[PDB]
């Protein structure tokens, strides 16, 4: 019901210090499962989740070879891009790619993705129809014409609709014990006196998966979107996530405040109070 697989490629040039470094990581939903680093002594795609370890030698060989080829191709791309933008050889530049599939509850492709960024900016992206491109500038229009000639869109559509979804569903089955078992947040509210006028109420959500979550404070039933401090969702380091929301209240009015937590692992939305 709305699962995804994503690969994230990053190449960074280092003029005068050898060839660009290529890094790849792969995710199923919010779980990283593979990595690759071209700087490694004998670069191999490596497992990063328990459920992928079972794949055989041929799986690792094939993906390692693709990663090694991509390393070289990215070096070609960086050189080409440098030329498109009339840039010198002295600067470090970055090429990023993300691609993958979202699968629906019926097991079919819901949406395919394939996009690139140069130096942190949108460069070119495969449209939702998986048959046309969106080029960000005149440089990216050169790339588009090369990729139209090479019928890249057609090849990517094939992967996204077939291979990509097939592997995602395989991973989902093999790792279903962890991937298809949402872990609801452990929640609690803390109270921190600032002075005699007021104090901070902080609502915690810990050890949840997946990352998607909603934390809000309410006074008498009205949201405090304007006076709520809401930190970015962060990794716990064990494959679960954390988040908190805080609000400043006048001493004696803590009563009027309730914290509301929504997460797919929860049977029902929680409302906490101090």
């Amino acid at each position: 019901g709305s699962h995804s697989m994503r690969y994230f490629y990053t190449s960074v040039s280092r003029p005068g210090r050898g060839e660009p470094r290529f890094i790849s990581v792969g995710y199923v939903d919010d779980t990283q499962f593979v990595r690759f680093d071209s700087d490694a002594a004998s670069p191999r795609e490596e497992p990063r989740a328990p459920w992928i370890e079972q794949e055989g030698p041929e799986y690792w060989d094939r993906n390692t070879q693709i990663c090694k080829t991509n390393t070289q191709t990215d070096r070609e791309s960086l050189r080409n891009l440098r030329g498109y933008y009339n840039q010198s050889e002295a600067g470090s530049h970055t090429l990023q790619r993300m691609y993958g599939c979202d699968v629906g509850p019926d097991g079919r492709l819901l949406r395919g993705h394939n996009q690139f960024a140069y130096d942190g900016k949108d460069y070119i992206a495969l449209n939702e129809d998986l048959s046309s491109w969106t080029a960000a500038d005149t440089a990216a229009q050169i790339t588009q014409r090369k990729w139209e000639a090479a019928r890249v869109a057609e090849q990517l559509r094939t992967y996204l609709e077939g291979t990509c979804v097939e592997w995602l569903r395989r991973y989902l089955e093999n790792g279903k014990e962890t991937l298809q078992r949402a872990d609801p947040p452990k929640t609690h509210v803390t109270h921190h006196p600032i002075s005699d006028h007021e104090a901070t109420l902080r609502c915690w959500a810990l050890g949840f998966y997946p990352a998607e979550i909603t934390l809000t404070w309410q006074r008498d039933g009205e949201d405090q979107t304007q006076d709520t401090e809401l930190v970015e969702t962060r990794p716990a380091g064990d494959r679960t996530f954390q988040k908190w929301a805080a609000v400043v209240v006048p001493s004696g009015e803590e009563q009027r405040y309730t914290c509301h937590v929504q997460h797919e692992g929860l049977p029902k939305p929680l409302t906490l109070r101090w």
Binding site: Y7, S24, G26, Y59, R62, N63, I66, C67, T69, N70, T73, E76, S77, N80, L81, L95, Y99, F116, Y123, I124, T143, K146, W147, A150, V152, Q155, L156, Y159, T163, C164, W167
Partner: peptide, 9 residues
């Protein structure tokens, strides 16, 4: 698994 298609920009 990674896409086996390869095209320089």
């Amino acid at each position: 698994s990674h896409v086996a298609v390869e095209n320089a920009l």
